Amino acid sequence: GTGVLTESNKKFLPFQQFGRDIADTTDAVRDPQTLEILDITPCSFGGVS
Amino acid sequence: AYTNSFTRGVYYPDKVFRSSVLHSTQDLFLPFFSNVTWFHNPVLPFNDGVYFASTEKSNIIRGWIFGTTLDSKTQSLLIVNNATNVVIKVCEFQFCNDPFLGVYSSANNCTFEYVSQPFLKNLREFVFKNIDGYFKIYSKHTPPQGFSALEPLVDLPIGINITRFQTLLAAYYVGYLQPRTFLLKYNENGTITDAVDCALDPLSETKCTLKSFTVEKGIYQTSNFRVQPTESIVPNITNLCPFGEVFNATRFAS
Amino acid sequence: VITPGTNTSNQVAVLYQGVNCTEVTGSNVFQTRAGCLIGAEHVNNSYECDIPIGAGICAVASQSIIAYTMSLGAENSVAYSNNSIAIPTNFTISVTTEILPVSMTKTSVDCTMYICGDSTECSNLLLQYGSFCTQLNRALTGIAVEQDKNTQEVFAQVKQIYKTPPIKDFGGFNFSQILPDPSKPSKRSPIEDLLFNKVTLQKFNGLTVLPPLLTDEMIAQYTSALLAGTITSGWTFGAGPALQIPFPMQMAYRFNGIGVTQNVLYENQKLIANQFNSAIGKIQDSLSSTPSALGKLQNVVNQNAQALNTLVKQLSSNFGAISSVLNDILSRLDPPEAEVQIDRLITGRLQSLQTYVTQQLIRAAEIRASANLAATKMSECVLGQSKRVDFCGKGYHLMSFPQSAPHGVVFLHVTYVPAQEKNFTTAPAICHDGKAHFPREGVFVSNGTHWFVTQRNFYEPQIITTDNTFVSGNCDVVIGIVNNTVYDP
Amino acid sequence: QKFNGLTVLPPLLTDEMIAQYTSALLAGTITSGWTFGAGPALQIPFPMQMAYRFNGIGVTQNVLYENQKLIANQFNSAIGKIQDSLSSTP
Amino acid sequence: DSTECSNLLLQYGSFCTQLNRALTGIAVEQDKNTQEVFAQVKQIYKTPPI
Amino acid sequence: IDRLITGRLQSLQTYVTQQLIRAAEIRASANLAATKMSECVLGQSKRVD
Numbered sequence: 001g002t003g004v005l006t007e008s009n010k011k012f013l014p015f016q017q018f019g020r021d022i023a024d025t026t027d028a029v030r031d032p033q034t035l036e037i038l039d040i041t042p043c044s045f046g047g048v049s
Numbered sequence: 050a051y052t053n054s055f056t057r058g059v060y061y062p063d064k065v066f067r068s069s070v071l072h073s074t075q076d077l078f079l080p081f082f083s084n085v086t087w088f089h090n091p092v093l094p095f096n097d098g099v100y101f102a103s104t105e106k107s108n109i110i111r112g113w114i115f116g117t118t119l120d121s122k123t124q125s126l127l128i129v130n131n132a133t134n135v136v137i138k139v140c141e142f143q144f145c146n147d148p149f150l151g152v153y154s155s156a157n158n159c160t161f162e163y164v165s166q167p168f169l170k171n172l173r174e175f176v177f178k179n180i181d182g183y184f185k186i187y188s189k190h191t192p193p194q195g196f197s198a199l200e201p202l203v204d205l206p207i208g209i210n211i212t213r214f215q216t217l218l219a220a221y222y223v224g225y226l227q228p229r230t231f232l233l234k235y236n237e238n239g240t241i242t243d244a245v246d247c248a249l250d251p252l253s254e255t256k257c258t259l260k261s262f263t264v265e266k267g268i269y270q271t272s273n274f275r276v277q278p279t280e281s282i283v284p285n286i287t288n289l290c291p292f293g294e295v296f297n298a299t300r301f302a303s
Numbered sequence: 304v305i306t307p308g309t310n311t312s313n314q315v316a317v318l319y320q321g322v323n324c325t326e327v328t329g330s331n332v333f334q335t336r337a338g339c340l341i342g343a344e345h346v347n348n349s350y351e352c353d354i355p356i357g358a359g360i361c362a363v364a365s366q367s368i369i370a371y372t373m374s375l376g377a378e379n380s381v382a383y384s385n386n387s388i389a390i391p392t393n394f395t396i397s398v399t400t401e402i403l404p405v406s407m408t409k410t411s412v413d414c415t416m417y418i419c420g421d422s423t424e425c426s427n428l429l430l431q432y433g434s435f436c437t438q439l440n441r442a443l444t445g446i447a448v449e450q451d452k453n454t455q456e457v458f459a460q461v462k463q464i465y466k467t468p469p470i471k472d473f474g475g476f477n478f479s480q481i482l483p484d485p486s487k488p489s490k491r492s493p494i495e496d497l498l499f500n501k502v503t504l505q506k507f508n509g510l511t512v513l514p515p516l517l518t519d520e521m522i523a524q525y526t527s528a529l530l531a532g533t534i535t536s537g538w539t540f541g542a543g544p545a546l547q548i549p550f551p552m553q554m555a556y557r558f559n560g561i562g563v564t565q566n567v568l569y570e571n572q573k574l575i576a577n578q579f580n581s582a583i584g585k586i587q588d589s590l591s592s593t594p595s596a597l598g599k600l601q602n603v604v605n606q607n608a609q610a611l612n613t614l615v616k617q618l619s620s621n622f623g624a625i626s627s628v629l630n631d632i633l634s635r636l637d638p639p640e641a642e643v644q645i646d647r648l649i650t651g652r653l654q655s656l657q658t659y660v661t662q663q664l665i666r667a668a669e670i671r672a673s674a675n676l677a678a679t680k681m682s683e684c685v686l687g688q689s690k691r692v693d694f695c696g697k698g699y700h701l702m703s704f705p706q707s708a709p710h711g712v713v714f715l716h717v718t719y720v721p722a723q724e725k726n727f728t729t730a731p732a733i734c735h736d737g738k739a740h741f742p743r744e745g746v747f748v749s750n751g752t753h754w755f756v757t758q759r760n761f762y763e764p765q766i767i768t769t770d771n772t773f774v775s776g777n778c779d780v781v782i783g784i785v786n787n788t789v790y791d792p
Numbered sequence: 793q794k795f796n797g798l799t800v801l802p803p804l805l806t807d808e809m810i811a812q813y814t815s816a817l818l819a820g821t822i823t824s825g826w827t828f829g830a831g832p833a834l835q836i837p838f839p840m841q842m843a844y845r846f847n848g849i850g851v852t853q854n855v856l857y858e859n860q861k862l863i864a865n866q867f868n869s870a871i872g873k874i875q876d877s878l879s880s881t882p
Numbered sequence: 883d884s885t886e887c888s889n890l891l892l893q894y895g896s897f898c899t900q901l902n903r904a905l906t907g908i909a910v911e912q913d914k915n916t917q918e919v920f921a922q923v924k925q926i927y928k929t930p931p932i
Numbered sequence: 933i934d935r936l937i938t939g940r941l942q943s944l945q946t947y948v949t950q951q952l953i954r955a956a957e958i959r960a961s962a963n964l965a966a967t968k969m970s971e972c973v974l975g976q977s978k979r980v981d
Contacts, residue, residue, distance in 0.1 A: 002421060012066045013239055015201055019066035023615040025507060028066060045416065046511055251304045252315045266308035268354055268362075270906065274319050275883075276326060321799055337802055355913065358802045359809060375812055375921070380928040381835045383823040389834035613896055620895030623934060651894070658897075658945060662904075665952050672960065692975035693922070694967075698830050721831040731840060731857050741853050746840070759844070775854035782839070782860055804913040805920070813920040817973055820927040829974030833927060848976050887933050897941060901948050908955045915962035919969055 008039040050087035060187040060199035067235040077226040081246040085224040098178040098226030119144040137163040182208035198241035307363035316343035343370040391721035396578040399696040403677040404711040409447035409513040417509030451516040453674035458525040465531040474551040475576030498708040541686030561699040622651025734778025735789040754787040
């Protein structure tokens with residue numbers, strides 16, 4: 001994916017590898033090697049008026 | 050024997066965190082309120098997945114075997130719990146007539162092995178599925194009414210075909226998974242707290258249609274009734290080709 | 304599936320739409336002409352509809368689900384005869400509400416980020432589809448600029464921001480539930496507070512939600528200006544300058560415009576005030592203690608949400624081609640053959656985006672029709688007093704108030720309802736000479752013995768004099784005419 | 793009138809019930825006038841109802857009574873004429 | 883009644899449940915239209931017999 | 933098959949879009965008829981024609 005990773009306070013269960021949203025888009029991921037939970041934000045966009 | 054399998058045997062299907070949501074998924078599940086078989090140890094089919102449950106006090110059940118013929122022609126799985134390590138082998142074993150833990154005699158052609166930290170008024174539930182060469186074991190141990198979701202344990206890349214299985218060894222329960230769609234309720238902490246079987250009764254069809262656990266008063270279209278055809282039914286045969294005077298002619302030719 | 308809601312029971316009935324009841328869990332089947340109803344018990348006692356089935360059948364009542372032919376209402380024969388009228392002797396003042404949606408959320412969806420993400424293979428293969436995406440963004444931009452026009456033509460009908468005077472002496476009327484509350488933030492009325500708390504309302508792959516041009520703090524300032532203008536000046540500020548007038552005198556104008564004389568207001572000014580204050584306080588409860596009163600505002604929100612939720616969930620569809628993920632198809636296949644699967648995914652996602660935009664365009668027309676209706680109701684009901692019946696609530700319209708709600712407006716229509724009538728005897732005219740007398744304004748009633756003139760909408764009987772009648776011809780041609788004295792003053 | 797995927801759902805109000813609504817509205821306005829649309833239906837004799845409706849278009853009330861039998865005759869002959877405006881030209 | 887695009891059609895996503903949603907919205911709106919036009923009396927008035 | 937699916941589904945979408953436009957037209961006409969039943973039948977209307 002493409003996005004901004006930030007530190008997150010979402011508590012995963014010890015088998016769940018990545019979060020998801022009610023659109024079924026992945027908005028969190030546990031990284032391996034340290035098992036931190038990382039949020040995913042889309043890289044900021046918008047029109048130019 | 051038979052027992053009702055009330056709302057029991059729901060497992061986390063996909064290792065995905067989901068928070069405060071109602072996710073509707075289609076996977077092999079044990080249907081709600083089915084007839085689970087109660088046993089007090091025969092071979093049993095595996096047809097497409099097996100739910101297993103056992104209540105005990107003194108770890109009397111110690112593992113399982115899985116396979117196709119269990120006769121050293123094809124490889125078979127052997128899951129055995131010691132007191133401290135659980136051992137999972139995939140080898141071409143020869144099985145005894147009544148295997149109980151000396152079953153492991155003549156362990157040949159061992160194509161997989163694995164050892165980990167062990168399993169097991171304290172009901173222990175397991176779900177075994179065998180999809181695309183992967184053997185998935187889900188379990189939960191809890192102190193059979195009520196709801197509890199089965200965390201996964203292992204996902205072994207064994208690649209072997211399984212048709213039958215058998216418990217090694219005083220009572221347990223064996224149920225069979227079916228390709229049914231559910232609606233699972235994921236908590237704020239990501240755990241499953243409730244589920245709805247979308248073909249159990251019409252009310253659960255509405256709950257799966259609306260993607261809600263509470264429906265409001267009204268009339269809701271859920272599905273399509275459609276009568277299926279039972280038979281198949283197909284010009285007064287009239288003009289036979291004149292093979293008689295070709296074959297029963299009184300005089301033939303040079 | 305007929306259900307009475309899972310907060311009442313878990314019984315359901317099942318309607319099979321349009322099949323005979325010979326073609327199939329069986330308890331008590333019932334043929335309906337709408338289908339086959341299984342699980343509902345057919346009764347003969349007709350009631351009022353709550354779960355509509357079809358062809359006249361409706362459907363829990365005393366721990367079972369029934370199915371009845373619905374009733375249209377209570378039958379009454381009103382006691383008609385030649386020479387009898389009923390005249391009201393009292394009234395109620397009824398404040399009803401009307402909730403109208405005004406605007407939607409101004410979404411805008413970029414194609415190239417939606418349909419192609421960041422894959423330049425997808426983008427370069429999308430350029431050959433032409434001007435579909437500038438068409439789609441032009442359509443959604445037209446919708447979005449129309450939403451702000453909807454809001455400002457509903458609410459911004461005051462040139463000036465009026466303020467109610469700091470002492471609230473309106474003759475006994477208590478507009479405290481509709482005037483803004485300064486002792487709280489956001490400066491909203493109690494009713495506008497419960498309208499915002501009872502409506503319960505996301506930036507991803509292509510979607511962006513433009514904020515509305517008028518903030519809610521500004522829409523509430525418009526609607527407090529409209530309230531202060533109506534309270535302090537009446538209808539005079541919708542026409543020209545705001546001409547102040549005391550609120551009982553304004554309400555006496557407004558009885559005088561529904562045909563009731565203005566002494567009926569003053570001589571009952573306390574009672575009327577109390578009825579107003581008790582009817583304006585039940586709006587608070589009838590919204591608070593009744594969910595799904597704001598359903599007309601709610602569905603709009605829900606529909607827009609699920610349209611977006613069907614758009615985003617349409618991204619995870621294969622549409623044919625082997626994967627719905629744009630990266631797992633560039634790193635799978637060779638690109639003289641990858642760009643037939645990419646193209647298949649483009650035409651699937653483009654038709655999904657285009658059908659979303661066509662659903663948006665055709666739903667924004669509904670909201671524009673409703674916003675035109677709300678602007679008409681603000682102009683005619685709030686800024687004036689309508690004579691057009693049931694346009695501003697049931698009853699003879701007195702005056703009405705706006706309240707801002709999220710993406711909509713709530714009108715509190717104060718109407719005059721006649722009440723506790725009694726029947727009398729009437730004549731078309733009264734002959735006291737060889738001349739026939741007709742009432743100037745009003746009608747000739749009889750209490751059984753003597754004859755009177757009342758106004759038509761409120762029973763106050765006067766003596767029939769020559770200054771509330773007029774003569775026309777002899778008392779020969781009027782079919783049905785009584786002889787009673789007409790007292791010359 | 794259904795073959796393949798398409799079904800025609802019957803309306804919730806049958807034509808008997810729509811005709812019962814229509815007779816309810818129409819018997820309300822004959823016997824009570826406009827008063828049944830606001831509050832309770834207050835009965836009023838139909839000449840005296842119609843005189844109010846002349847008085848609402850600026851014609852005074854005596855124009856009704858002094859021409860009442862004329863007005864009833866034009867009314868009946870105009871509703872008799874409106875069957876023939878639909879039982880004829882398509 | 884063929885299974886072969888009860889499988890290919892599922893690959894097209896939620897198009898056949900969006901169209902049904904639209905048509906049932908139209909159908910509920912038709913009954914709302916008739917109810918709004920005709921059901922404007924609480925009571926069923928009856929004309930006198932003579 | 934997929935050619936026939938993308939033909940018939942597009943034909944169905946065209947039907948549903950035409951029906952949604954025609955339903956909008958009939959809802960406008962039905963709102964007009966409800967207004968005429970209110971103002972013309974249940975009262976006496978001063979609005980010209």
